Design a protein around this ligand. Structure first.
Ligand SMILES: CC(=O)N[C@@H]1[C@@H](O[C@@H]2O[C@H](CO)[C@H](O)[C@H](O[C@H]3O[C@H](CO)[C@H](O)[C@H](O)[C@H]3O)[C@H]2O[C@@H]2O[C@@H](C)[C@@H](O)[C@@H](O)[C@@H]2O)[C@H](O)[C@@H](CO)O[C@H]1O
Ligand SMILES: CC(=O)N[C@@H]1[C@@H](O[C@@H]2O[C@H](CO)[C@H](O)[C@H](O[C@H]3O[C@H](CO)[C@H](O)[C@H](O)[C@H]3O)[C@H]2O[C@@H]2O[C@@H](C)[C@@H](O)[C@@H](O)[C@@H]2O)[C@H](O)[C@@H](CO)O[C@H]1O
Lengths: 138, 138
């Protein structure tokens, strides 16, 4: 189920942060935050915390296929407890912070960063806030 | 021109805050922030700062007609200068704060508040941030 979508047609990458606060409803489901590129609604970045297995799966869906999964060594979420996830893009990575701690980086596979105009948040997350902010590049 | 859209299908009213930060590009154009209700994409609240005339026009577009304009001349904007607009809904009004000053309140005309699932930001605004927060008091 779609919980939140945002569209910024001029392209929200690189140099933008998405900050999502919320918590899961279940102990053993999952949610995803996807960054989609236009045209095609390809998934440039899929961030998928899976609470049954305590694994964060990251991937891209390009040319009608999922690529190689990048699975983080740790799982800094707790089911049913509030978290903050920030995803910030630079020229080379999506950088993921959870509760203000740097957790992982994911190298861009879709290189056409300015085509990433759409954010979707799906499945088991009760959102308390979404912030989309133009940070720039440092 | 659509600059930003957000969809929150469970309803973002009442008790949510939307904070928009940005600046205009022109000295004498205009932008609008619209809260839309589903089904129908009716405009529950249209917030339209008009820089040529220094007037904030507020209205609703329901049953295929604009209603009575509620116009504020406080116009605490300056062309090309960063601003912060916060729109917070309670059970009775949309409350508007600009640069942390309360400017106006607008009584709900669309009474089906939970049907307000969509935010659109159009025309002459260069967005630097959009934040959408439940329990908009915090
Ligand atoms: C079984 C399969 O086809 N793939 C397994 C991997 O699961 C997919 O992992 C992807 C990330 O690498 C996505 O998370 C994907 O789900 C998303 O995409 C699909 C379309 O592909 C749907 O839109 C989902 O709604 C969306 O979340 C995962 O596939 C889904 O879950 C699988 C377990 C399976 O039930 C699929 O049918 C379902 O679409 C899995 O991570 C990997 C390791 O276990 O094994 C692959 O086989
Ligand atoms: C001329 C007219 O039809 N209406 C005048 C008022 O202008 C409209 O004001 C509305 C709020 O009360 C909206 O701001 C509207 O613009 C929005 O909606 C229209 C569709 O109705 C379009 O989608 C626009 O893109 C959108 O911003 C205003 O109408 C627009 O501006 C007018 C000046 C005119 O050019 C219209 O054709 C255009 O749609 C105006 O504020 C009022 C002042 O007294 O006079 C009304 O007649």
């Amino acid at each position: 189920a779609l919980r939140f979508e945002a569209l910024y047609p001029e392209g929200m990458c690189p140099g933008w942060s998405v900050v999502v606060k919320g918590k899961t409803s279940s102990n053993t489901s999952m949610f995803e935050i996807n960054f989609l590129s236009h045209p095609g609604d390809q998934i440039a970045f899929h961030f998928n915390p899976r609470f049954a297995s305590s694994r964060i799966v990251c991937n891209s869906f390009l040319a009608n296929h999922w690529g190689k999964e990048e699975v983080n060594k740790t799982f800094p979420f707790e089911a049913k407890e509030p978290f903050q996830v920030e995803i910030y893009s630079d020229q080379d990575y999506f950088h993921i912070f959870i509760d203000e701690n740097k957790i992982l980086q994911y190298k861009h596979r879709q290189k056409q960063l300015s085509s990433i105009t759409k954010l979707q948040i799906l499945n088991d997350i009760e959102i308390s806030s979404v912030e989309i902010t133009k940070r720039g590049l440092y």
